[PDB]
């Protein structure tokens, strides 16, 4: 009736509450590992950035994006999509390498023409050098990485363990090395294959850091989202409780009408 | 039953079906008697009528009479006053969950709602008592773990937890044992299994001793010999 | 289940498929069906007789009627006098079926009548002994032993639940008396099962021991798959990536539900229900995409009608599936992987 | 200094002398060094912080002296002693792999890594 | 082969005495796949 | 389907199914955002939101009250109008476009109006 | 507390500890307990009797018995009757403890009487002056003034909650009248924590006013720790702050 | 309440939520209707006020589902509605 329709919907809400609780807790567990990775990685990355800065960082482009395969990230997938979308007005023909299914869906809508490479098995794992390296090896061959004047990577920088700002950076190519001239304030021999090697090595080193930052932000957002869900569900629980109680009183009052029938006897 | 209890001076084992019909019947003649029916239309003297029936059924020094009274719970709500009044009056409640029946477990008993006032180390002995506590926990863990299994998946779960779930599933289908009255159904005669044998076999499962035995090789079978045999049957 | 919402239609379907047995000779296969209509308007009845004449089943139908206008005593008296008419067949050793649509309005008639008769008490304003009235009525339908009789009156009571309020006194009373409950759910009706039977709450206590032997074999784990589908589906709509095995269940389950669905006023031959359940249970349809399940059903049956019509004849004629017949049937399905 | 870093751990990212195996031969850095980039090859490495010397087996990477005497070192994974028998097992695999042949690079690297570890 | 693939393969080789941590083993063992795309249309997904 | 035709019945069936799902996902919609709804569903839900808005028709007696000139839509027109919308042909236009309008042609025209 | 969830057991435990004082020669501190078995079958009360005999408690215990079989007028007057026995003790200046188990069944009996006497039903179909009835019973218990002699009649009513329905009319009235409530929780009972007390939903309104000074000192902390433990039960599937882990450990132990 | 509503032509439901949350007049326009008074007005107050009832029941709807991707049309309505 009323009573049952309240109760079944309330049960749905309850079950959801339990699931979001469960998810949030498991998310916290995952979050520590995700965050841990980004510190070590970020420390490693900065040392290379020290070179690139001092060298000067001076520049069809590539877009790489990072999400997990897994969903319930939060709005990571579509906020990242939005920060891509602005620069997909600035490059509507950009070739997108999608590291993760979730960003793939949003971008796939925006231009399926752009979708050229995608990588599975991302979301399941926590970012690893093996993956980054293999992706790097494939990037050169598949995407013809060298063609772009500079690559660009989009990821989610985990600003705080309650926040995420989607962030991007440009991966510096051999072209960058070529026309940066304060590379000469780090001079090495022509015999050294250091431009073509350093390009590849920091192609991956930058990418891994971006992935770690993204993964931590993703898991962080998921925790935040699942916490807020639990809260929203509580409010609805309370609203249906008040309705339930009033309905219970009204059924008792109708029973009191039956008592009044007994009074007629 | 009184003639048996008293005059034949013997123990009995009474069976009545269904006592919700007993409740319903009295309510109707309350109304026909014009006596203002109490809550949810149930007769005013419901408690006291039930009480006379229960009081009559007891162990005296003349005999012992063991009633099994079926009770039908309309729309499976036990806080309905007619079931609730009966809920007090009985000593060894059993709930048969529709869900568990549907899972194909016959017995369809809900093992988390099976309650008997007697179940202690003083009653069934310390080993039995302890084992049954472990079973309850194992099953309760399995039920709790259904939520983790639900989203993350069975595969995505802790190793300690996974062995507990797997063992609980083995216990779950251990319960399923054939009935003589499910020769009509399954075609498999009932299986009478001694208390000691059940305690021993269930202990083994919990320890993981019978983790070389398939989950389904506990399904709808009785005895340990059969459980082992059905592992072989499935194996071959 | 909820009033009028195919409430009439479920019953008419039973009458219609029983045309096949009825046309055939042997009086035990003949159901001299009695449709009892209480509280319904003359126009509704007129549509009913028109439908029955359209499907030309009036050739064995009896319509006992108590229209909305007709007196509250006459309405009260209507089930009990319908029962006697049925008993004449039953007594004769003949099989028959009595649809009591809807007993809920009979109870109201006895409510109004009893209150006008100054009958003092009443749960929901229905005086006690309505259960006595209804119970005696329902217990007057039976399968009679060869020694004493040979007829079987079958009864189908119909109770229209007021907003699904099953705790209502009249629905509660009936549930105890009856040997099955066939809950129908409105949401599932809209969801596209038309009629929609909520099998989760529907039961048939006697169950299989009156199900066709072949159909008993095939639908053995159909129940298990569906039951699992219900549980799995409930968690599954929280849109998490479940185990692939779990999504196998989900996929298999989705297809099964769609398979069950059938349109109103269309009966179906048992010989052509055995294949569909075999196919489904043997998971061939689990693969076949949800949208084109309807296409598969129609076409598969047409395909068997064309080619494996020998096979269909055997299932019909012998009503059991040999190892060979099960294999033949499997092969036929595989051959029609076209969809 | 030395700012030895791995993605999974950071080993030094002061460290007075670092001895590095490079495509530029062998490079030693002590305090300030002239401002260079050197690619680190798969390597046997010595790192000294004070006179104390630590002996490392390294999967190659990159080395880049910053002109502020900050030796930015990036490599994938390292101790030499921890690595130092399974490498012999690996040699069997590497020989087998060479029999068939990226596989060429794999087998070549496995032999190279073994030789380089074997060197110490 | 590419320098970072070359170095990667070396790191993987280097974890084989085997006396190496879980993070190392995870860092040098991935079963991840990669779905190539073109146009929309996907050249088949295959192990990375 | 033998009265108002199979095509009508099929069209109506899809409307009913879509709306019942949409009603079902009302819980989910509130607890978890639109984005967090599955992609297949997110299209369905968005379609259903449009359909919901589509059902309004300004009346010719309440033309005064709504302030929108009343639109009466032929039955022959109706089946066509929903059919297209169900195939999402015109779906790509505001929910406002579907709000308080008559025939399919009017929706299209009001998209042009909104676009201005 | 929850229905038949060893309600009688929790109560019976108190009586056994009263054996310690009873054995003692301090006659004011000889609490002569009264158990009021309402609608409890003669077999159940026989078990009670045997258990009491086993624990040698029958020699200060009084059991006023109105069993399930025993008629509803007797049941109606049964708690009132019991109180009179207590008054004699109280009047003699002694102390005693009367445990009314359970007033929920008293309500039903009064209902049976009231309806048969054509007195109207009231909230939750219990007669309207059930409030007045309960209030009359529950105010008889009391610790008298010094001039009127230092005596008392301690009381501990036992109330059966259908499913924990504290909303229910008979619980709400009673909850207000008594100074304190203890609310046992079924999950805890099942989880083997017997007593199954839900600490949050157990309060005493006079409480620590009567408490041993020593025991007061070493159990203020206990209240605060447990309070934190309830909140800090909220993890399962992590690694927690050292403070949180300490709390969790303290709470679990 | 329903008995009165059905007799009366028009209702002017007021919401506590709006009252508490400032907004006096606190007159919910979801549940305020006038079904006879809309033709009792001077033409000036018919002309100026045209379809504003729809607009603020578009604002009501808009902020219902506002609680990410909001098109300029919806944003415009929201901006106008709030103001």
Coordinates of C-alpha atoms in Angstrom, one line a residue, chain C:
Chain C
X1 CA -2.9 -8.6 -7.8
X2 CA -4.2 -5.1 -8.6
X3 CA -7.7 -4.7 -10.0
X4 CA -8.7 -5.0 -13.7
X5 CA -5.1 -4.7 -14.8
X6 CA -5.2 -7.8 -17.0
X7 CA -7.2 -9.3 -14.1
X8 CA -9.8 -10.5 -16.6
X9 CA -7.1 -11.3 -19.1
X10 CA -5.1 -13.9 -17.1
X11 CA -8.2 -16.1 -16.7
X12 CA -9.2 -15.8 -20.4
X13 CA -5.8 -17.1 -21.4
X14 CA -6.4 -20.3 -19.4
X15 CA -9.7 -20.9 -21.2
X16 CA -8.2 -20.2 -24.5
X17 CA -5.3 -22.7 -24.4
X18 CA -7.6 -25.3 -23.1
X19 CA -9.4 -25.1 -26.4
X20 CA -6.8 -27.5 -27.7
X21 CA -7.6 -30.3 -25.2
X22 CA -11.3 -29.4 -25.3
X23 CA -11.6 -29.9 -29.1
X24 CA -10.1 -33.3 -28.5
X25 CA -12.4 -36.2 -27.3
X26 CA -12.1 -37.9 -23.9
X27 CA -14.1 -36.0 -21.2
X28 CA -11.2 -35.9 -18.7
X29 CA -9.3 -33.8 -21.2
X30 CA -12.5 -31.7 -21.7
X31 CA -12.8 -28.9 -19.2
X32 CA -16.4 -27.8 -19.1
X33 CA -15.3 -24.3 -18.0
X34 CA -17.5 -22.1 -15.9
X35 CA -16.6 -18.4 -15.7
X36 CA -18.2 -16.7 -12.8
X37 CA -18.4 -13.0 -13.0
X38 CA -19.5 -11.1 -9.9
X39 CA -19.9 -7.4 -9.8
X40 CA -19.1 -6.7 -13.4
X41 CA -21.0 -4.6 -15.8
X42 CA -23.2 -5.9 -18.5
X43 CA -21.0 -4.3 -21.1
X44 CA -17.9 -6.0 -19.6
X45 CA -19.8 -9.3 -19.7
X46 CA -20.8 -8.6 -23.3
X47 CA -17.3 -8.0 -24.3
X48 CA -16.4 -11.3 -22.5
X49 CA -18.9 -13.3 -24.4
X50 CA -17.8 -11.6 -27.6
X51 CA -14.2 -12.5 -27.0
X52 CA -15.2 -16.1 -26.2
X53 CA -17.3 -16.3 -29.4
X54 CA -14.5 -14.7 -31.4
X55 CA -12.2 -17.5 -30.2
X56 CA -15.2 -19.8 -30.5
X57 CA -14.8 -21.3 -27.1
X58 CA -18.4 -20.6 -26.1
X59 CA -18.8 -24.1 -27.5
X60 CA -17.8 -25.4 -24.0
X61 CA -18.0 -22.3 -21.8
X62 CA -20.7 -21.6 -19.3
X63 CA -21.1 -18.1 -18.1
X64 CA -22.6 -17.7 -14.7
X65 CA -23.1 -14.1 -14.1
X66 CA -24.0 -11.7 -11.4
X67 CA -23.9 -8.3 -12.9
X68 CA -23.2 -5.2 -10.8
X69 CA -26.9 -4.3 -10.7
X70 CA -27.9 -7.8 -9.5
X71 CA -28.8 -8.0 -5.8
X72 CA -26.4 -8.4 -3.0
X73 CA -28.1 -11.7 -1.9
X74 CA -28.0 -12.9 -5.5
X75 CA -24.3 -12.0 -5.7
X76 CA -23.6 -13.8 -2.4
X77 CA -25.5 -16.8 -3.6
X78 CA -23.7 -16.7 -7.0
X79 CA -20.5 -18.6 -6.1
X80 CA -22.3 -21.3 -4.2
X81 CA -24.8 -22.0 -7.0
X82 CA -21.9 -21.9 -9.5
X83 CA -20.3 -24.6 -7.5
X84 CA -23.3 -26.9 -7.8
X85 CA -23.3 -26.6 -11.6
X86 CA -19.6 -27.6 -11.6
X87 CA -20.3 -30.5 -9.3
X88 CA -22.8 -31.9 -11.8
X89 CA -19.9 -32.2 -14.2
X90 CA -17.5 -33.4 -11.4
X91 CA -20.0 -36.0 -10.2
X92 CA -20.4 -37.2 -13.8
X93 CA -16.7 -38.0 -13.7
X94 CA -16.0 -35.1 -16.0
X95 CA -13.2 -32.5 -15.6
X96 CA -14.1 -28.9 -15.5
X97 CA -12.6 -25.6 -14.3
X98 CA -14.4 -22.8 -12.3
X99 CA -13.0 -19.3 -12.4
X100 CA -14.4 -17.2 -9.5
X101 CA -13.8 -13.7 -10.5
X102 CA -13.8 -11.7 -8.2
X103 CA -14.5 -13.1 -4.7
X104 CA -13.5 -9.7 -3.3
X105 CA -16.8 -8.2 -4.5
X106 CA -18.7 -11.2 -3.1
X107 CA -17.3 -10.4 0.3
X108 CA -18.4 -6.8 0.0
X109 CA -21.9 -8.2 -0.9
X110 CA -21.9 -10.3 2.2
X111 CA -20.5 -7.3 4.1
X112 CA -23.3 -5.1 3.0
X113 CA -25.9 -7.9 3.5
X114 CA -24.5 -8.8 6.9
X115 CA -24.5 -5.3 8.2
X116 CA -28.0 -4.8 6.8
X117 CA -28.8 -8.0 8.6
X118 CA -27.5 -6.2 11.7
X119 CA -24.6 -8.7 12.0
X120 CA -22.6 -6.8 14.7
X121 CA -18.8 -7.6 14.3
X122 CA -16.4 -7.2 11.3
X123 CA -12.6 -7.0 10.7
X124 CA -12.4 -4.3 8.1
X125 CA -16.2 -4.3 8.4
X126 CA -16.4 -7.9 7.2
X127 CA -18.0 -10.1 10.0
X128 CA -16.3 -13.3 11.0
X129 CA -17.6 -16.4 9.1
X130 CA -16.7 -14.8 5.7
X131 CA -13.7 -17.1 6.0
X132 CA -16.2 -19.9 6.7
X133 CA -18.2 -18.9 3.6
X134 CA -15.2 -18.7 1.4
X135 CA -13.5 -21.8 2.7
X136 CA -16.5 -24.1 2.2
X137 CA -16.8 -22.7 -1.3
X138 CA -13.1 -23.4 -2.2
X139 CA -13.1 -26.8 -0.7
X140 CA -16.0 -27.8 -3.1
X141 CA -13.5 -28.3 -5.9
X142 CA -11.7 -31.6 -6.2
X143 CA -10.0 -34.4 -8.1
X144 CA -12.0 -37.4 -7.3
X145 CA -10.7 -40.9 -6.9
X146 CA -11.5 -43.4 -9.6
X147 CA -13.6 -45.5 -7.1
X148 CA -15.7 -42.5 -6.2
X149 CA -16.1 -40.2 -9.1
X150 CA -13.6 -39.4 -11.8
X151 CA -14.2 -35.7 -12.3
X152 CA -12.0 -33.0 -11.3
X153 CA -13.3 -29.5 -10.7
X154 CA -10.4 -27.1 -10.7
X155 CA -10.9 -23.8 -9.0
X156 CA -9.2 -20.5 -9.7
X157 CA -10.3 -17.8 -7.1
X158 CA -9.5 -14.3 -8.1
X159 CA -8.9 -11.6 -5.5
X160 CA -8.2 -8.1 -6.6
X161 CA -5.8 -6.6 -4.0
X162 CA -6.5 -3.1 -3.0
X163 CA -3.2 -1.4 -3.6
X164 CA -1.5 -4.8 -2.9
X165 CA -2.7 -4.8 0.7
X166 CA -2.2 -8.5 1.3
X167 CA -2.6 -8.0 5.0
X168 CA -6.2 -7.1 4.3
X169 CA -8.4 -9.6 6.0
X170 CA -10.1 -11.1 2.9
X171 CA -6.7 -11.5 1.1
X172 CA -5.2 -13.1 4.2
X173 CA -8.0 -15.5 4.6
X174 CA -7.9 -16.7 1.0
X175 CA -4.1 -17.2 1.0
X176 CA -4.4 -19.7 3.7
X177 CA -7.1 -21.7 2.0
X178 CA -5.6 -21.8 -1.5
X179 CA -3.1 -24.3 -2.9
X180 CA -1.2 -21.6 -4.9
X181 CA -0.8 -17.9 -5.0
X182 CA -0.2 -16.2 -8.3
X183 CA 0.9 -12.7 -7.5
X184 CA 0.8 -10.3 -10.4
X185 CA 2.8 -7.0 -10.2
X186 CA 1.9 -3.8 -11.9
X187 CA 5.4 -2.4 -12.2
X188 CA 6.5 -5.5 -14.0
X189 CA 3.4 -5.2 -16.2
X190 CA 4.6 -1.8 -17.3
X191 CA 8.1 -3.3 -17.6
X192 CA 6.6 -5.4 -20.3
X193 CA 5.6 -8.7 -19.1
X194 CA 1.9 -8.6 -20.1
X195 CA 0.5 -10.4 -18.2
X196 CA 3.1 -10.0 -15.4
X197 CA 3.5 -12.7 -12.7
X198 CA 5.8 -11.9 -9.9
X199 CA 7.2 -15.3 -9.6
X200 CA 9.2 -14.3 -6.5
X201 CA 5.9 -14.3 -4.5
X202 CA 4.0 -16.7 -6.7
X203 CA 3.9 -20.3 -5.5
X204 CA 2.1 -23.5 -6.3
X205 CA 2.2 -25.6 -3.2
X206 CA 1.5 -28.9 -4.9
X207 CA 3.8 -27.8 -7.7
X208 CA 5.4 -30.3 -10.0
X209 CA 3.4 -33.5 -10.0
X210 CA 0.9 -32.1 -12.4
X211 CA 3.6 -30.3 -14.6
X212 CA 4.2 -32.1 -18.0
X213 CA 7.0 -34.6 -17.5
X214 CA 9.0 -33.2 -20.4
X215 CA 8.4 -29.6 -19.2
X216 CA 9.5 -30.7 -15.7
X217 CA 12.7 -31.9 -17.0
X218 CA 13.5 -28.8 -19.1
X219 CA 12.5 -26.2 -16.6
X220 CA 14.5 -27.8 -13.8
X221 CA 17.1 -25.2 -13.4
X222 CA 15.1 -22.5 -15.1
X223 CA 13.8 -21.7 -11.6
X224 CA 17.3 -21.6 -10.2
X225 CA 18.7 -19.4 -12.9
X226 CA 15.8 -16.9 -12.6
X227 CA 16.0 -16.9 -8.8
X228 CA 19.7 -16.2 -9.0
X229 CA 18.9 -13.5 -11.6
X230 CA 16.7 -11.7 -9.2
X231 CA 19.3 -11.5 -6.4
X232 CA 22.1 -10.7 -8.8
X233 CA 20.1 -8.1 -10.7
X234 CA 19.2 -6.3 -7.5
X235 CA 22.8 -5.7 -6.6
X236 CA 23.7 -5.3 -10.3
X237 CA 21.7 -2.1 -10.7
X238 CA 24.2 -0.4 -8.3
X239 CA 26.2 -0.4 -11.6
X240 CA 29.4 -1.8 -10.3
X241 CA 31.6 -4.1 -12.4
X242 CA 30.6 -7.5 -11.1
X243 CA 32.4 -10.8 -11.6
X244 CA 32.2 -12.0 -15.2
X245 CA 30.5 -15.1 -13.8
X246 CA 28.1 -12.8 -12.0
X247 CA 27.5 -11.0 -15.3
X248 CA 27.0 -14.3 -17.0
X249 CA 24.2 -14.9 -14.6
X250 CA 22.9 -11.4 -15.2
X251 CA 23.1 -11.8 -19.0
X252 CA 21.5 -15.3 -18.9
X253 CA 18.9 -14.0 -16.5
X254 CA 17.9 -10.9 -18.6
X255 CA 17.3 -13.1 -21.6
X256 CA 15.2 -15.6 -19.7
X257 CA 12.9 -12.9 -18.4
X258 CA 12.4 -11.6 -21.9
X259 CA 11.8 -15.1 -23.1
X260 CA 8.9 -15.6 -20.6
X261 CA 7.0 -12.5 -21.9
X262 CA 4.0 -13.3 -24.1
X263 CA 1.2 -11.1 -25.4
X264 CA -2.4 -11.1 -24.3
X265 CA -5.0 -13.3 -26.1
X266 CA -2.3 -15.5 -27.5
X267 CA -2.2 -19.1 -26.1
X268 CA 0.8 -21.4 -26.9
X269 CA 1.2 -25.1 -27.5
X270 CA 3.2 -27.0 -25.0
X271 CA 5.1 -28.8 -27.7
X272 CA 6.5 -25.4 -28.6
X273 CA 7.2 -24.4 -25.0
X274 CA 9.5 -27.4 -24.5
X275 CA 12.0 -26.1 -27.1
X276 CA 12.1 -22.6 -25.8
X277 CA 12.9 -23.6 -22.3
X278 CA 15.4 -26.2 -23.5
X279 CA 17.2 -23.6 -25.6
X280 CA 17.3 -21.1 -22.8
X281 CA 18.4 -23.5 -20.2
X282 CA 21.1 -24.9 -22.6
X283 CA 22.2 -21.3 -22.8
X284 CA 22.0 -20.7 -26.5
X285 CA 19.7 -17.8 -25.9
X286 CA 22.1 -16.4 -23.3
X287 CA 24.3 -15.2 -26.1
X288 CA 21.4 -14.0 -28.4
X289 CA 20.9 -10.3 -27.9
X290 CA 18.1 -9.0 -25.8
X291 CA 16.4 -7.0 -28.5
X292 CA 16.2 -9.8 -31.0
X293 CA 15.0 -12.4 -28.5
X294 CA 11.4 -11.7 -29.7
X295 CA 12.6 -12.3 -33.3
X296 CA 14.3 -15.5 -32.2
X297 CA 11.3 -16.9 -30.5
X298 CA 9.0 -16.4 -33.4
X299 CA 11.5 -17.6 -36.0
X300 CA 12.8 -20.5 -34.0
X301 CA 9.3 -21.9 -33.7
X302 CA 8.7 -21.3 -37.4
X303 CA 12.0 -23.0 -38.2
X304 CA 11.1 -26.1 -36.1
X305 CA 7.6 -26.0 -37.7
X306 CA 9.2 -26.1 -41.0
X307 CA 12.1 -28.5 -40.4
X308 CA 11.9 -30.4 -37.1
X309 CA 8.2 -30.9 -37.3
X310 CA 8.8 -34.6 -36.9
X311 CA 10.6 -33.7 -33.7
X312 CA 7.7 -31.5 -32.6
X313 CA 5.3 -34.3 -33.2
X314 CA 7.3 -36.7 -31.0
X315 CA 7.4 -34.2 -28.1
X316 CA 3.7 -33.7 -28.5
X317 CA 2.8 -37.3 -28.9
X318 CA 5.0 -39.0 -26.4
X319 CA 5.3 -36.1 -23.9
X320 CA 8.8 -37.2 -22.8
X321 CA 12.2 -36.4 -24.2
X322 CA 14.5 -39.3 -24.9
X323 CA 18.3 -38.8 -24.7
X324 CA 18.0 -38.8 -28.5
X325 CA 15.2 -36.3 -28.5
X326 CA 17.1 -33.9 -26.2
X327 CA 20.1 -34.2 -28.5
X328 CA 17.9 -33.7 -31.6
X329 CA 16.4 -30.6 -30.0
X330 CA 19.9 -29.3 -29.1
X331 CA 21.1 -29.8 -32.7
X332 CA 18.0 -28.1 -34.1
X333 CA 18.6 -25.0 -31.9
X334 CA 22.3 -24.9 -32.9
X335 CA 21.3 -25.1 -36.6
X336 CA 19.1 -22.0 -36.1
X337 CA 21.8 -19.8 -34.7
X338 CA 20.7 -17.2 -37.3
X339 CA 18.3 -15.6 -34.9

